[PDB]
Structure formats: C-alpha cells, structure tokens
Amino acid sequence: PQAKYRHDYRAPDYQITDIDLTFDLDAQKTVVTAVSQAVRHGASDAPLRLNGEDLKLVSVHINDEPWTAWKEEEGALVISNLPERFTLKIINEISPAANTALEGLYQSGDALCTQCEAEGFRHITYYLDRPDVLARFTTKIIADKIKYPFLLSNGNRVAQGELENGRHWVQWQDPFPKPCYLFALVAGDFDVLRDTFTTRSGREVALELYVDRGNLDRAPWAMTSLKNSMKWDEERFGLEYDLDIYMIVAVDFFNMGAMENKGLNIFNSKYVLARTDTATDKDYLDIERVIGHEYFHNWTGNRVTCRDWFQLSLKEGLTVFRDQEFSSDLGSRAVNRINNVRTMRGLQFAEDASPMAHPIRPDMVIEMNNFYTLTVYEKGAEVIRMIHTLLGEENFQKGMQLYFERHDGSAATCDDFVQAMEDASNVDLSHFRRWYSQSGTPIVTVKDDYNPETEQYTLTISQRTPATPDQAEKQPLHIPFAIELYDNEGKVIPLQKGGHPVNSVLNVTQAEQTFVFDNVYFQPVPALLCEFSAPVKLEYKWSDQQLTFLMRHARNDFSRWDAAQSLLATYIKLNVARHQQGQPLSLPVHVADAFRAVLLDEKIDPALAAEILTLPSVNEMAELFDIIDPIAIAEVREALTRTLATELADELLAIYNANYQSEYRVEHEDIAKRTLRNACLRFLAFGETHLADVLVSKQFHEANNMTDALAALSAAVAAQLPCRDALMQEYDDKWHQNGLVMDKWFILQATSPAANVLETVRGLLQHRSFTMSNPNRIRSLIGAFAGSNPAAFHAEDGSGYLFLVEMLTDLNSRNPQVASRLIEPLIRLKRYDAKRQEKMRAALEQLKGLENLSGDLYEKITKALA
Ligand code: NA
Ligand code: NA
Ligand code: NA
Ligand code: NA
Ligand code: NA
Ligand code: NA
Ligand code: NA
Ligand code: NA
Ligand code: NA
Ligand code: NA
Ligand code: NA
Ligand code: NA
Ligand code: NA
Ligand code: NA
Ligand code: NA
Ligand SMILES: [Zn+2]
C-alpha cells in the first residue's frame, strides 16, 4: 500500500456536476444505478479515473451508449476516449450484509445506513471519491416497505411512489453541491422525535431524530441540544441553518463517533441516547458536545469543505474549536478548558512523541482513516485558539466572515483559512503557519530576574521542538505566551515598558528572547502560559510556595488548577522514582495542606474545586516521564489517593455531605456540586475499609441517577471494597440488555486494579452483553484494557500484548478501522523499558506477518518497527 503526499495534489482532470443515484435496496444484494453529468477539465487524451472498492460492475454507458473503452484495475475503473461533456451511467452491485468494516453501505441491526467519510462512497459506486469534486445529488431509494418504512437521504423529498410486491420508494434532492463523503442513506423502521426550530430570520426547520423502536424515552436531551446548538451558532457566529429539515439517525453500529452528512447526520447511539437512570452527567455533556460539533460542521465543513484530505484539520480543528466554545459558553468555561488541556497534555502529547506523529496538516498518508487523530482534532483546535488569542474575538469573527465570503460553496485549504484571518485582521500570520507544517510538542523554557534597583522584571524565554520520527528538521514557532504577574497581596501588576502598556500575550517567536517589564514594584509571582495559551510543555523552576500562592490568588480559575497540577507533578515524579527503589510515598505536609485549603475554601467555585481534587490520570502522569513505568505510575496514583484520603478524611467527609443533592438536574451548578461530591467520594473510598464500604454501598443503592450510581460503583472497583462483587452483579442483572449502559461496566472491569483483571477481561469476551461485531463493546472492554489500564496491559509477563495480538488478529479482517484504533498502545513501545520493548516489538512483528494485513494496520506497524 503506497503513501500519498500532500505536495502531489493536482486539480482533477474531470469534474462531476450532478449525480442521480437509484438504490434498489436489499441487505444481501443492493443494486446501484448512478447517472453523473461530467465535464473534462484536463487534457483531451486523459482518461476518467474512477475509484471503486468491492463493487460488482454490471454496466457502463456514456450518453446511453454501452461503452467499450474501459478497464477495471486495482481500486479503479478507467474510462478512455471521452467527449468533453457527457452523461456517465454506471450500474453495480454491493452487499451490505457482508460489510463488517462499516464503511460504505452496511447493516446496523435491522437498519441499513452509510458511512462515507473519508473514502467510503467508492464502496457504493465508481466515482470521483475526492472532496474537491462537488456535485448536486438526487437520490432514489427503492425497498421493502415493511422492513424499511423510512427511506432517508440528504435534503428534501421530491418524489414518492409505491410498487408491486410490497416495495416503495422515496426520492430526495439536496440543492447544495457536495463532495461524496457527505452523502448519506438510511433505511429502516424507527421511532421519530419531531420538533421545530425557527431561525433568527424566520426560516422554519423541521427537526427529526430517528431512534430504534422503544428509545423515544432517551431522545429529548439530544433534541434539546440540537436546538441549543442552532441558537448558539446564530448568537456567537451569526450562522443559520440553510435547509428545511434537519435529520439525525442514531445507530448502534458505527466506527466514527458521529457524522455531519448534510441534513442527515448519522450518530453513534452513544452520542444521542440519554435518560437520568442510564446516562451520567458526562454522557449528557458529551451528547451536547457531539450534537453541537456535527451541527457546526454545517458551515465549517459542508458549506466550505476540504480541497483534499490533507486539509482535514481545516474542518476538524475549527469545528472542535466551535464545539469547545459552545460547551464553554453554555456551561463551565473553566471545567471545559481544564478537561481539554488534560486531553492535550495526556493524550495528544503522547501521540506527538510517537511513531505516528504528524503535523495538523499531514504531509504523507497511507490510510486516511488513520488521520482522524487527537492531533488533527484537538491540537487543530489549539491552533485555531491561538489564532483567536492573537486576533481577539472581534477580529477572529471578521476572519470567519471573510472565509465564508471567499469560500462558501467551495473546497478550501488550511492556508486559505489562515489567509482570511490574516487579511481580515491585519495580523501577520506568516510565521504562525508553521504550526500547520511542523509536528511534535514545543518545549518552552522560562527563567526570570527581578532587579529591585531598577524595578524591572525580566523573562528569558527559550523554545525548541525535539525532532520527531517524521521530521528531522524543526524551527521556532510563533508562540502566543500569555502571562500575568502577581504582587505579594495577590493583585495583578500592570504590564508596561518605557511608559506604555504591554499586551499580556507575549509573542515568543525566536529560539531565545527576553521580555522586560518596568515599574514592577514588587518581586512578582508569575502565572505563565495562562489558559494554556499555546500547546507546549512549560519548563519553569517553580517553588512549591509560588504554586500554592497561585492556587489561592490566581484570577483565572484555570491558573489555580494548573498550579495544582505543577505542584503535583513534582511529587508524582518523586514517588515514581521511590516506587522503583521499593520505597513508600513521601509527600510534604505543606502539599497536603494546599489541598485541604481547596476543600475548605467557601469562595471557590465547586466546579473548580472538583477538578483540583481530581488527580491526573495515568495517561497524564505518563507524559511527565521519558521512560514510562506504568506499574509505578498506577501504584503511586493509588498511594497518593490513599495518603490524601487519610490526611484529609474529616474534610472530605464534610464536603461530601455538604454537597448532597436530593433532586437530580442536568444543570451546570448542580453538575458542579455533584462532581465535587463524587471527587470527595473517590478519596473516601480509600479510607478505613468499614467506613468506605458502607458509604460507597449506600450511594450505589440510594442513587437516583446514573452519575451517582456509577461514581459509587467505580470507587468499589478502584478500592477493591468488600461490596464490589455484589454491586457489579446487581448492575449486570439490571442492565445487561442495554449495551450503552453495559459499556460503563466493561470499562470498570477492564480498568480494575485486581490482580486477575486479564483473566476477567478474557472471560468477558463471552459475556451476554459483549460482541466483537460492535465497536462500542470492543472499545469499552478491549480498548479500555489496552489504553486505560496500562499497568495490566504492560504486565511484565507480556500477557497484555499477547491478548491484544489475538484481538487484533480478528479485527484486522473484521473491522480494520477499529483494529487501528486499538493497536495504538503497542506502537508506543519506545517509551518503555528494554524488556517491554522487546515483547512489544515481537507482538508487532507477529501482526506484520498476518495474512491479508490491512493498510490501516500496515501504516502503524511499519512506523512502529522503524
Ligand atoms: Na441529476
Ligand atoms: Na476495480
Ligand atoms: Na463538480
Ligand atoms: Na464536512
Ligand atoms: Na459558560
Ligand atoms: Na485507503
Ligand atoms: Na481502507
Ligand atoms: Na503575512
Ligand atoms: Na529567577
Ligand atoms: Na523564579
Ligand atoms: Na519546573
Ligand atoms: Na500517555
Ligand atoms: Na499511601
Ligand atoms: Na456475547
Ligand atoms: Na496508555
Ligand atoms: Zn468533526
């Protein structure tokens, strides 16, 4: 399988302007008729090269003439000797029931549905399956009326009819030209939640949520969030919906989270279905996020699309930015920012230090489905946020306006977006563009000097990015470096120099530079990289007292949290080294006291307190180290939890009790209180056994919502409490018929600290609620084990790697996209000790030799074994 390269982009030899599709739908054999209106733009002698995968070609006509000048080749139909303008008619067959990869047209339970992004439409017919070919679609669907009473495609219904033998048909038209990755089709029997939204200018939009029969009780929150999304996009970005109907279909079998197909979004059920006894607060807020995200794509992705797939972050970074801004505006901005930073530093930084490292705009791709990444998405969004930091809101919105004015109705590039922002704002982004081309995480080193004779404070700031396996050359970036300086009372020191104010966003553009601030009348405590102003590692020699001071005084809630993270990092590192020497946890009394103070501070937002009291995950901990010791990390996380639980026992119980809420509401103040209460419960679970068991068991049994029930259950597992097995059985017996709810339980089993976790996980391959055919179940049991229990995955006997190999041997053939997600923990081998590397390498070599190795896995394995 051959790499493709961004620098090889060339405009297509042929365009398609209009396509009329007919589907004679059947699970075993679907017949597709595609009539495309084509226009030659290249040389007269160039053939039309269509993409196609696993299609049974029935016929090829050009202007209704059966065509002889064609040939099928690997992945392609190559059609020669064409006129400059013509009608192409292709008839082909496909088999949805055989489609275990869930790409193209496939079966989800009894429904038929599609996934076309990135390159799935070529599994449906022979086409120009590239996103700079935009065509007006019309779609006729013919099927059995009893099995498929709802026949859905993009746009509006233009025709309908009934046929002999129990078949019927519906034809759809979408006026907006689209790339084929935005085509969708759905056929099935659903319950439908129907509502309306009226846009600011008065356009009435029919809203329709399709869910499996019996799931209407779980639909209203996703509908609410849809309307919230539409209102917010009007208020914040001035964007309205552009069609007459907005359809969302929730399907149980889905690889990609959710999908923005124009007017017909298809969602994994996990990001639609919620009710208070099935879904947690985090599920609610994830529904909200993802509903918003797909909606936001209507403009940032659909009305302006991608010229080629190397521009994926043009839509994904921008739309993740939008979903964050939506969440943050409606909910707690500090909690959203904190959690997005946790993702960046724990999960994305790890990718940027891996063999799969790439810039947000990749240069080389073998399988484009491998590049729906933390980098393209989350780092993409940090890059858009840097633009927002550099420009400010008003100028950033001016750039959005210019981007749409220039590019509405077209496929554009990352560079086009940057140019719009630059031209609308007058801010120079020439240097800033390097963020699109350079991979790896920059390291920003800061040293300071206070000169009491001159009352000047000097920051000396250096940057470097280490080489990555994909790029040997690195250069300095344009790093927006936000600061704030605090005097000894906790008040902000005005930034100025030579009599003029200095912006608090420093432009760190060189390998090394100094910034001098005048009229600094007290030695400052600095808050550095405020609100994570650039996606960088920060190296500053903090004293503990500077950090506890920020925890008390910093103006932005994020900075209080970040200071606590910096304070904890020192002691996480200390204690991992101690663990490797067989020594127990050591923690200064003054560090425990800082967290006691957070517990007892009445003035702190409980949302913020909860996050300060949520320890970094094992993934976030790993990124503090060059060589990861996953057992030490897991054991130190536990020991730290236990030490704090002992030292803060009375305070934790008092705050736990103070935040009791008898009514359950999905409201942000209530969510905040519950997150704080359940943060205290995590530590309390690690108190004296008798107290902890009673407290946890009682919360599980008295809970009136799944947030509280799951928090108790998770604490029974994490602390190995006496009540654990009984509560886990109770949950299984109550919820085994509900896969989304059982996913939470598979995750707890997979992440259990119990010594026999792998045996349990293997046994759960036969569980009544588990199936290898469902990506959510795979993710929740197998994925959670490999990715979220690195201590067990990395068991010294190598048993974790052997288990993953067996699962991957199945999934390579069944569903390569899911396989490729799951291999990620194995490709991190160079971060581990030599003996682990040797076992991981042996595992990778075994997979390398699989018969019919997927391109998806090939790309990752070859990078890892290099
Ligand atoms: Na047409
Ligand atoms: Na072919
Ligand atoms: Na076109
Ligand atoms: Na899109
Ligand atoms: Na807010
Ligand atoms: Na491919
Ligand atoms: Na593929
Ligand atoms: Na410029
Ligand atoms: Na200093
Ligand atoms: Na200092
Ligand atoms: Na430091
Ligand atoms: Na990590
Ligand atoms: Na301990
Ligand atoms: Na099963
Ligand atoms: Na991991
Ligand atoms: Zn997206």
HEC string for 337-353? HHHHHHHHHHHHHHHHC
Please tell me the distance between residue 52's alpha carbon and the centre of ligand 6 in angstroms: 11
Domain, as residue range, for 818: 542-866
Residues 337 and 229 in one domain: no
Q: How far apart are alpha carbons 641 and 382 in whole angstroms? A: 31
Q: Which of 409, 385, 278 is nearest to 321 (CA)?
A: 385
Please tell me the distance between residue 40's alpha carbon and the centre of ligand 1 in angstroms: 17
Last residue of a domain, one of 190, 215, 237: 190
Q: Over the range 797-835, which residues count as b (16 or more CB within 10 Å of their CB) and which as e?
A: ebbbbebbbebbeebbbebbbbbbbbbbbbbbbebbeee
Residues 766 and 685 in one domain: yes
The full 3-state SS of 359-383, as one line of letters, equals CCCCCEECCHHHHCCHHHHHHHHHH
Q: How far apart are alpha carbons 383 and 313 in whole angstroms? A: 10
Q: Going along 644-740, which residue ranges are E strands?
A: none
Residues 281 and 336 in one domain: yes
Q: Is the dihedral of CA 751, 752, 757, 761 positive or negative?
A: negative
Please tell me the distance between residue 427's alpha carbon and the centre of ligand 8 in angstroms: 8
User: Which CATH number goes with the domain that contains 322?
Assistant: 1.10.390.10
Q: Could you tell me which residues are annotated as the binding site for Zn(2+)?
A: 293, 297, 316
Please tell me the distance between residue 17's alpha carbon and the centre of ligand 3 in angstroms: 4
In a domain, 184, yes or no: yes
> Which residues are close to ligand 1, an ion, with C-beta < 5 A?
18, 20
Please tell me the distance between residue 177's alpha carbon and the centre of ligand 3 in angstroms: 7
Specify the DSSP class assigned to residue 622: H
Nearest ligand for residue 174 CA: 1
Method: X-ray
Q: Amino acid identity, residue 539?
A: E
Q: How far apart are alpha carbons 354 and 832 in whole angstroms? A: 12
Q: Could you tell me which residues are annotated as the binding site for substrate?
A: 117, 257-261
Instruction: Copy the structure tokens of residue 140.
Output: 């006729």
Q: How far apart are alpha carbons 824 and 353 in whole angstroms? A: 13
Q: Amino acid identity, residue 222?
A: A
Q: How far apart are alpha carbons 100 and 115 in whole angstroms? A: 12
Last residue of a domain, one of 392, 416, 439: 439
Give the list of residues 6+ apart from residue 339 with CB closer than 8 angstroms, or none. 611
Task: Count Cα atoms within 13 angstroms, Cβ side, for 123.
Answer: 21
Beta strands 245-251 and 204-212: pairing type? Answer: parallel
Helices (H), 353-474: 374, 380-391, 393-407, 414-425, 434-437
Contact 750, 788 (CB under 8 A): yes
Q: How far apart are alpha carbons 247 and 157 in whole angstroms? A: 12
Q: Which of 653, 655, 722 is nearest to 694 (CA)?
A: 722
| Residue whose entry in the numeric block shows the structure tokens 């490709």 | 827
Q: How far apart are alpha carbons 506 and 759 in whole angstroms? A: 53
How is the chain split among helix, strand and coil, in percent rounded to 5?
45, 20, 35
Contact 482, 389 (CB under 8 A): yes
Helix axes 668-684, 281-296, angle to 10 degrees: 130
Contact 515, 506 (CB under 8 A): yes
CA angle 708, 714, 719 (to 5 degrees): 125
Please tell me the distance between residue 348's alpha carbon and the centre of ligand 15 in angstroms: 12
Please tell me the distance between residue 391's alpha carbon and the centre of ligand 9 in angstroms: 31
The full 3-state SS of 779-811, as one line of letters, equals HHHHHHHHHHCHHHHCCCCCHHHHHHHHHHHHH
Beta strands 76-79 and 150-153: pairing type? Answer: unpaired
Q: Over the range 215-242, which residues count as b (16 or more CB within 10 Å of their CB) and which as e?
A: beebbebbbebbbbbbebbbeebebbbb
Q: How far apart are alpha carbons 318 and 303 in whole angstroms? A: 14
Contact 412, 370 (CB under 8 A): no
Residues 706 and 766 in one domain: yes
Nearest ligand for residue 524 CA: 10
Q: What are phi and psi of 608, to 5 degrees?
A: -70, -45
Strands, sheet with 48-51, edge to edge from the N-terminal-most edge strand: 48-51, 76-79, 70-73
| Residue whose entry in the numeric block shows the structure tokens 């539409």 | 230
Contact 249, 210 (CB under 8 A): yes
In a domain, 1, yes or no: no
In a domain, 782, yes or no: yes
Helix axes 799-814, 834-848, angle to 10 degrees: 20
Burial of 28 (0-12, 13-18, 19+ CB in 10 A): exposed
Residues 482 and 573 in one domain: no
**Structural domain total, the chain:** 5
Q: What are phi and psi of 210, to 5 degrees?
A: -100, 125
Q: What are phi and psi of 116, to 5 degrees?
A: -105, -25
User: Which CATH number goes with the domain that contains 265?
Assistant: 3.30.2010.30
Q: Could you tell me which residues are annotated as the binding site?
A: 117, 257-261, 293, 297, 316
Residues 241 and 142 in one domain: no
Residues 460 and 316 in one domain: no
| Residue whose entry in the numeric block shows the structure tokens 């205290």 | 680
In a 3-state reduction of DSSP, which class is residue 178?
A: strand
Helix axes 649-658, 630-647, angle to 10 degrees: 80
Please tell me the distance between residue 256's alpha carbon and the centre of ligand 16 in angstroms: 10
Residues 257 and 136 in one domain: no
In a domain, 244, yes or no: yes
Please tell me the distance between residue 449's alpha carbon and the centre of ligand 9 in angstroms: 5
Last residue of a domain, one of 160, 190, 220: 190
Q: Which of 259, 246, 263, 252 is nearest to 215 (CA)?
A: 252
User: Which CATH number goes with the domain that contains 454?
Assistant: 2.60.40.1840
User: Which CATH number goes with the domain that contains 156?
Assistant: 2.60.40.1730
> Which residues are close to ligand 5, an ion, with C-beta < 5 A?
333
Contact 247, 232 (CB under 8 A): no
| Residue whose entry in the numeric block shows the structure tokens 């982004």 | 429
Q: How far apart are alpha carbons 591 and 846 in whole angstroms? A: 47
β-partners of residue 276 are none
In a 3-state reduction of DSSP, which class is residue 860?
A: helix
Specify the DSSP class assigned to residue 236: I
Q: C-alpha distances in angstroms, 266 versus 136, 245, 282? A: 20, 14, 21
| Residue whose entry in the numeric block shows the structure tokens 């909910």 | 331
Cα distance between the two ends of the chain: 17
Nearest ligand for residue 788 CA: 15
Please tell me the distance between residue 335's alpha carbon and the centre of ligand 13 in angstroms: 28
Q: Is 422 left (phi over 0), alpha (psi -120 to 50) or beta?
A: alpha
Q: How far apart are alpha carbons 409 and 299 in whole angstroms? A: 10
| Residue 593 CB neighbour total at 10 angstroms | 13
Q: Amino acid identity, residue 674?
A: R
In a domain, 513, yes or no: yes
Q: How far apart are alpha carbons 152 and 113 in whole angstroms? A: 9
| Residue 762 CB neighbour total at 10 angstroms | 16
Contact 97, 73 (CB under 8 A): no
Instruction: Copy the structure tokens of residue 163.
Output: 């046929």
Instruction: Copy the structure tokens of residue 549.
Output: 């001071």
In a 3-state reduction of DSSP, which class is residue 149?
A: coil
Helix axes 668-684, 649-658, angle to 10 degrees: 150
Q: How far apart are alpha carbons 379 and 534 in whole angstroms? A: 10
Residues 648 and 710 in one domain: yes
User: Which CATH number goes with the domain that contains 721?
Assistant: 1.25.50.10
Q: Which of 226, 225, 220 is nearest to 207 (CA)?
A: 226
Secondary structure element (H or E) that encloses residue 717, with its range: helix 706-718
Q: How far apart are alpha carbons 189 and 213 in whole angstroms? A: 7
> Which residues are close to ligand 14, an ion, with C-beta < 5 A?
770
In a 3-state reduction of DSSP, which class is residue 465?
A: coil
Contact 526, 485 (CB under 8 A): yes
Contact 258, 290 (CB under 8 A): yes
Q: Which of 119, 294, 422, 623 is catalytic?
A: 294
Q: Which of 44, 37, 9 is nearest to 137 (CA)?
A: 37
DSSP 449-494: EEETTTTEEEEEEEEE---BTTBS------EEEEEEEE-TTSPBPP
Q: How far apart are alpha carbons 180 and 32 in whole angstroms? A: 15
Q: How far apart are alpha carbons 116 and 133 in whole angstroms? A: 14
Nearest ligand for residue 831 CA: 12
The full 3-state SS of 555-605, as one line of letters, equals CCHHHHHHHHHHHHHHHHHHHHHHHHCCCCCCCCHHHHHHHHHHHHCCCCC
Q: Which of 89, 39, 92, 33 is nearest to 63 (CA)?
A: 89
Residues 588 and 720 in one domain: yes
Contact 518, 455 (CB under 8 A): yes
Residues 226 and 243 in one domain: yes
Beta strands 150-153 and 30-40: pairing type? Answer: unpaired
Q: Which of 530, 516, 536 is nearest to 464 (CA)?
A: 536
Q: Which of 601, 510, 506 is nearest to 553 (CA)?
A: 601
Q: How far apart are alpha carbons 80 and 250 in whole angstroms? A: 42
Instruction: Copy the structure tokens of residue 208.
Output: 């329709």
> Which residues are close to ligand 10, an ion, with C-beta < 5 A?
448
Chain-centre distance for alpha carbon 104: 22
Q: How far apart are alpha carbons 430 and 603 in whole angstroms? A: 44
Residues 602 and 716 in one domain: yes
Contact 9, 307 (CB under 8 A): yes
| Residue whose entry in the numeric block shows the structure tokens 């102003």 | 533
Give the list of residues 6+ apart from residue 209 with CB closer than 8 angstroms, or none. 192, 193, 194, 219, 222, 223, 226, 247, 248, 250, 272
Q: How far apart are alpha carbons 227 and 207 in whole angstroms? A: 9
Contact 864, 355 (CB under 8 A): yes
Q: How far apart are alpha carbons 711 and 708 in whole angstroms? A: 5
In this structure, the chain runs to a length of 866
Give the list of residues 6+ apart from residue 465 with CB closer than 8 angstroms, or none. 438, 440, 441, 442, 443, 474, 477
Nearest ligand for residue 18 CA: 1
In a domain, 5, yes or no: no
Resolution in A: 1.9
Q: Longest Cα pair distance anywhere in the chain, in angstroms?
A: 96
Secondary structure element (H or E) that encloses residue 552, with its range: helix 544-553
- Whether 531 sits among the annotated catalytic residues: the reply is no
Q: Amino acid identity, residue 843?
A: A
Q: Over the range 121-153, which residues count as b (16 or more CB within 10 Å of their CB) and which as e?
A: bbbbbbbbbbbbbbbbbbbbbbbeeebbebbbb
Nearest ligand for residue 445 CA: 11
Q: How far apart are alpha carbons 581 and 577 in whole angstroms? A: 7
Chain-centre distance for alpha carbon 76: 32
Instruction: Copy the structure tokens of residue 39.
Output: 């226009």
Strands, sheet with 512-517, edge to edge from the N-terminal-most edge strand: 512-517, 456-464, 443-451, 537-540
| Residue whose entry in the numeric block shows the structure tokens 């800033």 | 432
